[PDB]
């Protein structure tokens, strides 16, 4: 951990990045047998606003 | 996303990073270049003298790698084993109808002439040739590859197995640590002998000398571990090979699978050169290795663990992969199999269980990918209390797992 | 599922994995090829000298297996075999009527060329032949079937019975660690002798020398363990072979059962060559092993364990099988048996007792319990979990990689 930097701001930024990647898992069907899941349908924003992006 | 720009001054930044080639090479794309695999041991020094040469060399000192190879070929020239079928791999047709081949029916050449001591050594040793010496000489390779305190457990293996109406003791002095006989692993010829012996006895399983396999066996699928975890993942999920393929949900895991399955490589074939690609020097870099398939290896081994795999707990956790993304994929997979039992009536007395038959949100009955991906989409892409519990139930009560394993990874992730 | 294709670019991938060879070999198919079990007793010269060769070879760390073989052959001429009825196995007619047959009525041949010491060794020991020496020599085989400190608590078995009507004592050199008489089981001709002995006294239980089985018994049904666990499960559930079969709920346990029950193999016959398929060299990969029947072994022994089996505790847990699916299956079976007690009046004094929502079914019938499992959306009940909890908690020191350890971890949390 280096000295003379803005820890608070840098960490709250790093948390937000980590949280985003970490809650938004990649996940998508890669191979198939002639039967593929197609993700969108009406995919809105969870539980009102404040919901996870 | 070709063009990125700094928004404060409207200027253009071009994000880039150090390149990393290190390509892989396939077994097949080697026989497209040479129809034979050379084995150099130009030593026409008598068998009985070679016998003495290595014995006192092993007792203590600078045992020549040139010496031990020369002995082995001579001691193993046993033209044994009648071909029961045909033996063809990568175009090479070594075995016919009922032909009696041997080891070194691979292909064999002769190089150099410089040796250490003078002709007639010390005539103290009897036969003890085909009896035990090779089993020791070959057994040391396996012991050489390790570095953990298993070396002593695998040298007990050597000594206890070499008592086939033979009964002797130790041979070298200093314990291991990669320095003594570990020089041998880096000899092009020594490894090729190890491989030919394994290959040959894997064919002639029933053979009075197939005991030479103990120790010569770790050359088989040497650094093809990723392939091995694909087999293992099937037997644990109990799913078909293709049905396991369809549960691969991360781009870089699909990639590795494509790379691992490229056609014309004889990977599923009975008695091929494929399993010995490294030691025969057919390939400098394995496409089937865990280091070149890290995303897959981690995913598969994780999934297997949540499913009570005993081995998976000690598999290594690779670096530079999308952990969080890979684990959520594993959990879902493990959760699907782990909560949907196969369970169907198999035998009867004219009395079968007819299966005729929570419509909103509730885990899908079967183990089908499309079913599950839609269900997970309904759980806004984040794992439920139950499946987070299922993971905990599985991992808690795991004891004594080493660090950097997927075992310690999994416990530390799910046991909260 | 013939074709799989990457969806991102529409190219076909062909999923495949390394092969497994080692098919099973059946005792019937052996007598399809040959019609005899060749026993190669290499040397045929001097019985009295052989008696000397062995004792001397036994006092020091060196004795030929050829010499102890030739000795066993000479010492065991119990051509005393008053046949009760007939005897026939796998198309081979061993005997009939009231014929007096011998131990080696199982095909004897001569072999190679080499022998160790000079003719007359030491004329020290006498009359020790048809007394103990064989009993000792044969005893050492089952002593060789171990690796842990079981040997020194099983060589007691030796000297103790090597004293009954004989009084003899300590003779071995190096304790153990795969060195001494623990190599004898590698000799194709040695194992064949032990097998011929155990097979003989199994027919003739009431013979003078019935003792000899004290080390040769471990040959019977060697590598046929999965077949035993099937017997144990029947005894433990109190159910019939027919009924137990129907409670098999997984495809791989079905295949393995199907492979174990192949119809032309004399497995239920009293005196057969089948139970010695390994030592007679009839098969090199037993179909009845628990390595060829991993699924069934786990299943059977886990169900046993929840039903209070003491032997199930230490059963080995196989690799590369479907633990989760099999465990669910075993739980449902064990649960059925363990809450539907047989319980029926057996004796009377002219005074009998006739017996006839979302609650566990009446009897022990698979169709019925499966329908009840359906009604519980294919997942084990919390009462079921408590049942297995109770069955596993308070299990003492259990070793690693057993189905005992597996079950407590799974059900006690």
Curated annotation (Swiss-Prot), chain C:
Pfam families the UniProt entry points to: Rhabdo_ncap
Keywords of the record, alphabetical order, are: Capsid protein, Helical capsid protein, Host cytoplasm, Ribonucleoprotein, RNA-binding, Viral nucleoprotein, Viral RNA replication, Virion
One GO MF term attached to the UniProt entry: RNA binding
Identify the residues that bind RNA: 142, 151, 205, 213, 285, 316, 399
Superkingdom, natural source: Viruses
Q: Where is this region: Interaction with the phosphoprotein?
A: 349-381
GO BP annotation list:
RNA replication; viral transcription
Localisation per UniProt entry: Virion; Host cytoplasm
One GO cellular component term noted in the UniProt record for this chain? viral nucleocapsid
The UniProt function text for this chain reads: Encapsidates the genome in a ratio of one N per nine ribonucleotides, protecting it from nucleases. The encapsidated genomic RNA is termed the NC and serves as template for transcription and replication. The nucleocapsid is bullet-shaped with the tip containing 8 turns of a conical spiral before reaching the helical cylindrical trunk. Nucleocapsid assembly is concomitant with replication, therefore viral replication depends on the intracellular concentration of free N, termed N(0). All replicative products are resistant to nucleases.
Give the UniProt family note: Belongs to the vesiculovirus nucleocapsid protein family.
Subunit details for this protein? Homomultimerizes to form the nucleocapsid. Binds to viral genomic RNA; this interaction contributes to the virion assembly. N in the nucleocapsid interacts (via C-terminus) with the P protein (via C-terminus); this interaction allows to package the L polymerase in the virion and positions the polymerase on the template, since P acts as a bridge between N and L. N(0) interacts with the P protein; this interaction prevents the uncontrolled aggregation of N(0). Interacts with the matrix protein (inner layer); this interaction contributes to the virion assembly. Interacts with the L polymerase.
Q: What is this protein called?
A: Nucleoprotein
In its UniProt entry, the species of origin is given as Vesicular stomatitis Indiana virus (strain San Juan) (VSIV)
Taxonomically, what lineage is the organism?
A: Viruses, Riboviria, Orthornavirae, Negarnaviricota, Haploviricotina
Q: Which gene encodes it?
A: N
């Amino acid at each position: 951990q280096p000295d003379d930097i803005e820890y608070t701001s840098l960490t709250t930024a790093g948390l937000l990045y980590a949280y985003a990647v970490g809650s938004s898992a990649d996940l998508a069907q890669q191979f198939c047998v002639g039967d593929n899941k197609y993700t969108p349908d009406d995919s809105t924003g969870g539980l009102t606003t404040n919901a996870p992006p | 996303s070709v063009t990125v720009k700094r928004i404060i001054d409207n200027t253009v930044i071009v994000p880039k990073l150090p390149a990393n080639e290190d390509p892989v090479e396939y077994p097949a794309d080697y026989f497209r270049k040479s129809k034979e695999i050379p084995l150099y041991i130009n030593t026409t020094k008598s068998l009985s003298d070679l016998r003495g040469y290595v014995y006192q060399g092993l007792k203590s000192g600078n045992v020549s790698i040139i010496h031990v190879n020369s002995y082995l070929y001579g001691a193993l020239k046993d033209i044994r084993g009648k071909l029961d079928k045909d033996w063809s791999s990568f175009g090479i047709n070594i075995g016919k109808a009922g032909d009696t081949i041997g080891i070194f029916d691979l292909v064999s050449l002769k190089a150099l002439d410089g040796v250490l001591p003078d002709g007639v050594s010390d005539a103290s040793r009897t036969s003890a040739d085909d009896k035990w010496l090779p089993l020791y000489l070959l057994g040391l390779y396996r012991v050489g590859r390790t570095q953990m305190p298993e070396y002593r457990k695998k040298l007990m293996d050597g000594l206890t197995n070499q008592c086939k109406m033979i009964n002797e003791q130790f041979e070298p002095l200093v314990p291991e640590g990669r320095d003594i006989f570990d020089v041998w692993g880096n000899d092009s010829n020594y490894t090729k002998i190890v491989a030919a012996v394994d290959m040959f006895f894997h064919m002639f399983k029933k053979h009075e000398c197939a005991s030479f396999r103990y120790g010569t066996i770790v050359s088989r699928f040497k650094d093809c571990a990723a392939l091995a975890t694909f087999g293992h993942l099937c037997k644990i999920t109990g799913m078909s090979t293709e049905d396991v393929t369809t549960w691969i949900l991360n781009r870089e895991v699909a990639d590795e699978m494509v790379q691992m399955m490229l056609p014309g490589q004889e990977i599923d074939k009975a008695d091929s050169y494929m399993p010995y690609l490294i030691d025969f020097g057919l390939s400098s870099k394995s496409p089937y290795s865990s280091v070149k398939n890290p995303a897959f290896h981690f995913w598969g081994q994780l999934t297997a663990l949540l499913l009570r795999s005993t081995r998976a707990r000690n598999a290594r956790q690779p670096d530079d992969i999308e952990y969080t993304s890979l684990t959520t994929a594993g959990l879902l997979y493990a959760y699907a199999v782990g909560s949907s039992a196969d369970l169907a009536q198999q035998f009867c007395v004219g009395d079968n269980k007819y299966t005729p038959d929570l419509t909103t949100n509730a885990p899908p009955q079967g183990r089908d990918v499309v079913e599950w991906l839609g269900w997970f989409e309904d759980q806004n892409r984040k794992p439920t209390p139950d499946m987070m519990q299922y993971a905990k139930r599985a991992v808690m009560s795991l004891q004594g797992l080493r660090e950097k394993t997927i075992g310690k990874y999994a416990k530390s992730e799910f046991d909260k």
